[PDB]
Each structure stands twice: as structure tokens, then as C-alpha cells.
Design a protein around this ligand. Sequence first.
Ligand SMILES: Nc1ncnc2c1ncn2[C@@H]1O[C@H](COP(=O)(O)OP(=O)(O)O)[C@@H](O)[C@H]1O
Ligand SMILES: [Mg+2]
Lengths: 76, 95, 102
Amino acid sequence: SLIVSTQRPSELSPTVLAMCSNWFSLRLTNERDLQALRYAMESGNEQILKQISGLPRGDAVAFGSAFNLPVRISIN
Amino acid sequence: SLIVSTQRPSELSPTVLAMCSNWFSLRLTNERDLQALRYAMESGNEQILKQISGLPRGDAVAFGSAFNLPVRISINQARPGPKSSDAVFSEEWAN
Amino acid sequence: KRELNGYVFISEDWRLPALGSSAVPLTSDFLNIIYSIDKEELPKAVELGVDSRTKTVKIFASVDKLLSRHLAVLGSTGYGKSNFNALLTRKVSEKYPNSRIV
Ligand SMILES: Nc1ncnc2c1ncn2[C@@H]1O[C@H](COP(=O)(O)OP(=O)(O)O)[C@@H](O)[C@H]1O
Ligand SMILES: [Mg+2]
């Protein structure tokens, strides 16, 4: 098991991005991290990604192989 | 006969993918794979290759010299079928 | 247009008719003229096949005009390049095999 909580994953080879099970995206502004996240991000989801600029406090989006369709998750 | 099986055609060698005279293609997941997968076809078109992303389990797309026109075929489930050799965390956590 | 006692086909494409002129279909008699040779290479012509849309008019070609420069035959893999090559070179290169195919 490898669950790495980091903010600079670009130092990891991009080939490993294919074996992940769920993708998380908080407020991202820096070019490299967001570009790497989009580099292996499931197609068909553009509207929710571009609207991140208007996210209120504590708002986030989370989905992946466990979430069949896109969800806006606010953790209780 | 040589049969090539993989899950990343876009990262595969172009000549490896081109040593085929018939085709039976199943689901391919990522969208970025289609960039180099667009060359994979030899006797087909684009109207039927765009529905591989949504192909469910067990179905396939067949085109070649043995078919008049490309078809989407629902292959029957094999009896008996394959088995699994990997456990689940719940079985171990039972103690 | 008429020349002496028959007709001839020209390949100029800026002449247009006038308003109110009637429209007629083309008969096989006028279709023969469009797909013919220049009245002088008839004894030196080879028959290849027939047109597709109407399958009524034959096609002839000049020996000197064909086998004088580069000639190319195209196709696709798994589509008959071997088959089409064999058939076409069979029907074209019978009487005069003296040409070179390295
Ligand atoms: N005498 C014939 N009559 C009818 N069909 C023919 C004849 N000879 C060849 N063909 C057709 O031409 C096709 C040639 O394709 P093929 O040679 O298999 O392609 P490739 O050589 O690129 O694999 C065949 O499908 C065959 O049905
Ligand atoms: Mg061939």
C-alpha cells in the first residue's frame, strides 16, 4: 500500500498515475501540480474542474473509480 | 499465429500493433490512449471505434476479412469460466 | 461540336449556356464520343474494361502513351495488392512482355 499525502507529486514518474483508485483535487493554483493532476484525469469532467476558482471555504470535489459519476464532496 | 494482449496500446510499438490480419478489441479505459490508438485500425472507420470507451464487460468489436461490415458482438459467457487467486481484506480481518 | 462528319470533345470549362435553354439527358451515342481516342490511335489501342455507372461503353488506351514513363499501381494490405497486381499485370503485359519489372 502507498498512500502518499503530498503537494509536489511531479517528482514521481507519471507512469504510476494509472494504478490509482481515486483522485482528489482541492484548491489548486500552481501550474505544475494541477497540470500533473490533469495529465491523468478522467475525461468527461470539465465544468466542475474550471469552476474551482469560485469554491467557498471548505468546498471540494472528490470522485474516481469508487465514485462512478462526479461528486462535490464536503467532508462533515 | 502471434497474438498481442496488453492494456496500453498507445505506449506499444507501432509495428507490434500492425502484425494483425483480424481484430477483436475489448474496452480500453483512458482517453489519452486514443491519440496513438487512432492508427490501430486497418480495415475500419471512426464511427465504430468511438464506442470502445463505454464497452461493457464481455462485449467486443470485430472487423476484418471475415466480416462484411464491422459489428458489435455480445459474446456469451463461458461455462465454466475463469477463477480468481487473490484474497480480500474482509476474509483476513475475520480472524 | 461537329468537325467533318462526326463529333469531337473539348475540355474547356468556362463556357455556360443562356437562360431559358432546355436540358436533355445524354444518350449512349454521345457517351461514346466523350470516352474515345483521337481518331488516329485506333489501330494501336488496347481494350481494358467497361465503365461502372452505365456498363455500356468500352475503354481503350494508347500503347505508346501508357508504357513510356513511370507507371504505378496502388492498393492496400489485406485488400488484394497481390491479387490486383497479378490480375492487372496479367491482362496488361501479355502481348509485349519486353518491358522491365525488376
Ligand atoms: N477470380 C476471382 N473471382 C472472384 N474474386 C476474386 C478472384 N480472384 C481474387 N478475388 C478476390 O480478390 C480479393 C483479394 O484480396 P487479397 O488478395 O486476400 O488481399 P491481400 O493480398 O492484400 O491480403 C479476395 O477477397 C478474392 O475474393
Ligand atoms: Mg497485400
